[PDB]
Design a protein around this motif. Structure first.
Motif, PDB file in Angstrom:
ATOM      1  N   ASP A   1      -5.203  -3.768  -4.615  1.00 36.35           N
ATOM      2  CA  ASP A   1      -4.143  -4.039  -5.671  1.00 36.35           C
ATOM      3  C   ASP A   1      -3.439  -3.020  -5.661  1.00 36.35           C
ATOM      4  O   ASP A   1      -2.398  -2.846  -6.467  1.00 36.35           O
ATOM      5  CB  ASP A   1      -4.783  -4.595  -6.615  1.00 36.35           C
TER       6      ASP A   1
ATOM      7  N   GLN B   1      -8.404 -11.921   1.937  1.00 41.98           N
ATOM      8  CA  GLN B   1      -7.915 -10.940   0.605  1.00 41.98           C
ATOM      9  C   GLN B   1      -6.371 -11.235   0.332  1.00 41.98           C
ATOM     10  O   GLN B   1      -5.568 -11.507   1.045  1.00 41.98           O
ATOM     11  CB  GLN B   1      -8.196  -9.520   1.366  1.00 41.98           C
ATOM     12  N   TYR B   2      -6.157 -10.975  -0.999  1.00 36.22           N
ATOM     13  CA  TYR B   2      -4.867 -11.204  -1.407  1.00 36.22           C
ATOM     14  C   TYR B   2      -4.654 -10.337  -2.603  1.00 36.22           C
ATOM     15  O   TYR B   2      -5.142 -10.547  -3.847  1.00 36.22           O
ATOM     16  CB  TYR B   2      -4.544 -12.625  -1.753  1.00 36.22           C
ATOM     17  N   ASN B   3      -3.837  -9.182  -2.550  1.00 35.85           N
ATOM     18  CA  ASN B   3      -3.401  -8.283  -3.523  1.00 35.85           C
ATOM     19  C   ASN B   3      -2.563  -8.814  -4.619  1.00 35.85           C
ATOM     20  O   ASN B   3      -1.995  -9.853  -4.295  1.00 35.85           O
ATOM     21  CB  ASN B   3      -3.191  -6.890  -3.145  1.00 35.85           C
ATOM     22  N   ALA B   4      -2.410  -8.220  -5.717  1.00 36.73           N
ATOM     23  CA  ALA B   4      -1.516  -8.349  -6.894  1.00 36.73           C
ATOM     24  C   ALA B   4      -0.138  -8.335  -6.791  1.00 36.73           C
ATOM     25  O   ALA B   4       0.602  -9.053  -7.282  1.00 36.73           O
ATOM     26  CB  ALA B   4      -2.040  -7.844  -8.256  1.00 36.73           C
ATOM     27  N   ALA B   5       0.025  -7.272  -5.755  1.00 35.68           N
ATOM     28  CA  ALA B   5       1.721  -7.283  -5.448  1.00 35.68           C
ATOM     29  C   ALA B   5       2.095  -8.726  -4.963  1.00 35.68           C
ATOM     30  O   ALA B   5       3.138  -8.863  -5.233  1.00 35.68           O
ATOM     31  CB  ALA B   5       1.843  -6.134  -4.547  1.00 35.68           C
ATOM     32  N   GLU B   6       1.434  -9.145  -3.906  1.00 34.97           N
ATOM     33  CA  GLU B   6       1.682 -10.361  -3.370  1.00 34.97           C
ATOM     34  C   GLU B   6       1.907 -11.611  -4.375  1.00 34.97           C
ATOM     35  O   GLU B   6       2.749 -12.493  -4.307  1.00 34.97           O
ATOM     36  CB  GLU B   6       0.780 -10.856  -2.067  1.00 34.97           C
TER      37      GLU B   6
ATOM     38  N   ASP C   1       2.764 -10.946  -7.386  1.00 37.17           N
ATOM     39  CA  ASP C   1       4.039 -10.701  -8.267  1.00 37.17           C
ATOM     40  C   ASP C   1       5.116 -11.445  -7.701  1.00 37.17           C
ATOM     41  O   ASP C   1       6.138 -11.714  -8.010  1.00 37.17           O
ATOM     42  CB  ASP C   1       4.181  -9.279  -8.132  1.00 37.17           C
TER      43      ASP C   1
ATOM     44  N   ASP D   1      -2.105 -16.617  -8.472  1.00 33.56           N
ATOM     45  CA  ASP D   1      -3.016 -15.641  -8.969  1.00 33.56           C
ATOM     46  C   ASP D   1      -3.887 -15.329  -7.892  1.00 33.56           C
ATOM     47  O   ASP D   1      -4.489 -16.267  -7.165  1.00 33.56           O
ATOM     48  CB  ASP D   1      -3.732 -16.666 -10.029  1.00 33.56           C
ATOM     49  N   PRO D   2      -4.004 -13.901  -7.473  1.00 35.81           N
ATOM     50  CA  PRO D   2      -4.867 -13.644  -6.330  1.00 35.81           C
ATOM     51  C   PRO D   2      -5.916 -14.337  -5.960  1.00 35.81           C
ATOM     52  O   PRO D   2      -6.415 -15.232  -4.910  1.00 35.81           O
ATOM     53  CB  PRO D   2      -4.839 -12.293  -6.475  1.00 35.81           C
ATOM     54  N   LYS D   3      -6.929 -14.404  -7.090  1.00 36.93           N
ATOM     55  CA  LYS D   3      -8.264 -15.193  -6.887  1.00 36.93           C
ATOM     56  C   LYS D   3      -8.182 -16.510  -6.655  1.00 36.93           C
ATOM     57  O   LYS D   3      -9.173 -17.055  -5.906  1.00 36.93           O
ATOM     58  CB  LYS D   3      -8.996 -14.781  -8.190  1.00 36.93           C
TER      59      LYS D   3
ATOM     60  N   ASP E   1     -11.387  -4.901  -2.230  1.00 41.24           N
ATOM     61  CA  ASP E   1     -10.327  -5.823  -2.886  1.00 41.24           C
ATOM     62  C   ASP E   1      -9.761  -5.026  -4.027  1.00 41.24           C
ATOM     63  O   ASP E   1      -8.420  -5.072  -4.333  1.00 41.24           O
ATOM     64  CB  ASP E   1     -10.994  -6.945  -3.477  1.00 41.24           C
TER      65      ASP E   1
END
Ligand SMILES: *C(=O)/C=C\c1ccc(O)cc1
Length: 125
Positions: free
Chosen positions: A24, A41-46, A48, A53-55, A20
């Motif tokens: 990011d 999973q979910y990165n910070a760009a998505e 943005d 908030d990813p988490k 993870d």
């Protein structure tokens, strides 16, 4: 930064090695869903792009909970068709507009090297 190109032909291979933290580091949005549309999973760009908030969105259902506008034959329908087929690899533009300023994006859905996981790559257009 991780040198992976959006739309690359062997991307599924490249991200298979990523945790993870490294995800990011990508230059585009990355979301990993299981066969039912749940978020793994979910990165910070998505984050943005949508404001999530990813988490906080991980564990949620993308189509029912997170992105309802994607619940249509044009997005969700292509996804459910692919999971069943055991094969998915389609690219197409789309307008993200649920609780956010309409954002036009290029979406790339592709089956992950893993058993029952599917990738959703997104970038601004
Ligand atoms: C439509 O709903 C498409 C994308 C999206 C994803 C998350 C949030 O919060 C808004 C919009």
């Amino acid at each position: 930064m991780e040198h992976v190109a959006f739309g690359s032909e062997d991307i599924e291979n490249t991200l298979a090695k990523m945790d993870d933290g490294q995800l990011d580091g990508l230059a585009f949005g990355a979301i990993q869903l299981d066969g039912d549309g749940n978020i793994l999973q979910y990165n910070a760009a998505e984050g943005d792009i949508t404001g999530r908030d990813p988490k906080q969105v991980i564990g949620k259902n993308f189509f029912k909970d997170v992105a309802p506008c994607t619940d249509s034959p044009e997005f969700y329908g292509k996804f459910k068709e692919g999971v069943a087929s055991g094969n998915l690899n389609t690219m197409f533009e789309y307008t993200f507009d649920y609780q956010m300023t309409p954002t036009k994006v290029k979406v790339h859905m592709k089956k992950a090297l893993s058993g029952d996981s599917y990738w959703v790559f997104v970038k601004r257009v």
